[PDB]
Amino acid sequence: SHMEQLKCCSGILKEMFAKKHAAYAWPFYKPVDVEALGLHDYCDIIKHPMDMSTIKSKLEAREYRDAQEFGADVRLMFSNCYKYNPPDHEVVAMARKLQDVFEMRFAKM
Ligand SMILES: Cc1[nH]c(-c2ccccc2Oc2ccc(Cl)cc2)cc1C(N)=O
C-alpha cells in the first residue's frame, strides 16, 4: 500500500533527523546556503538542490506518489553532495554515513 509506504518514509526521515545521527546528518537538514563563502558555483553545478527539510515538506504536501519518489529525492540530496564536492571532503564522508542509515531502512521497509 502506497499510504503505508509513505508513513514508513516519514519514519525513515524522522530517524535521519534524530539525535543518534546528528553528528553527520546536520549538513543535510536545510537547503545549502548558496550565498555562503565557497558556494558561489553551487547553482552552476547543482541544478536540482535537495535537503531533508524540503523532503519533509514534500511528504507533508503529498508530493510523493510512492516510496520510490521519496527515495529519489533522498538519493538526489546525496548525489548533489557527491557531485559538487571533492571526493576527500569531510561533507562527502558525512553524506556516506547518512546514506548508510537511509539505504538500510529503505531496503527493509
Ligand atoms: C550538503 C552541504 N551542506 C553544507 C553545509 C550546511 C550547513 C552549514 C554548513 C555547511 O557547510 C559544510 C561544510 C563542510 C562540512 Cl564538513 C560540513 C558542512 C555544505 C554542503 C556541501 N558542501 O555539499
Swiss-Prot record:
<feature type="domain" description="Bromo 2">
    <location>
        <begin position="4"/>
        <end position="109"/>
    </location>
</feature>
<feature type="site" description="Acetylated histone binding">
    <location>
        <position position="85"/>
    </location>
</feature>
<protein>
    <recommendedName>
        <fullName>Bromodomain-containing protein 4</fullName>
    </recommendedName>
</protein>
<comment type="subunit">
    <text>Interacts with p53/TP53; the interaction is direct. Interacts (via CTD region) with CDK9 and CCNT1, acting as an associated component of P-TEFb complex. Interacts with RELA (when acetylated at 'Lys-310'). Interacts (via NET domain) with NSD3, CHD4, BICRA and ATAD5. The interaction with BICRA bridges BRD4 to the GBAF complex. Interacts (via NET domain) with JMJD6 (via JmjC and N-terminal domains); the interaction is stronger in presence of ssRNA and recruits JMJD6 on distal enhancers. Interacts with NSD3. Interacts with NIPBL.</text>
</comment>
<comment type="subunit">
    <text>(Microbial infection) Interacts with bovine papillomavirus type 1 regulatory protein E2. This interactions may serve for the tethering of viral genomes to host mitotic chromosomes allowing successful partitioning of the viral genome during cell division.</text>
</comment>
<comment type="similarity">
    <text>Belongs to the BET family.</text>
</comment>
<comment type="function">
    <text>Chromatin reader protein that recognizes and binds acetylated histones and plays a key role in transmission of epigenetic memory across cell divisions and transcription regulation. Remains associated with acetylated chromatin throughout the entire cell cycle and provides epigenetic memory for postmitotic G1 gene transcription by preserving acetylated chromatin status and maintaining high-order chromatin structure. During interphase, plays a key role in regulating the transcription of signal-inducible genes by associating with the P-TEFb complex and recruiting it to promoters.</text>
</comment>
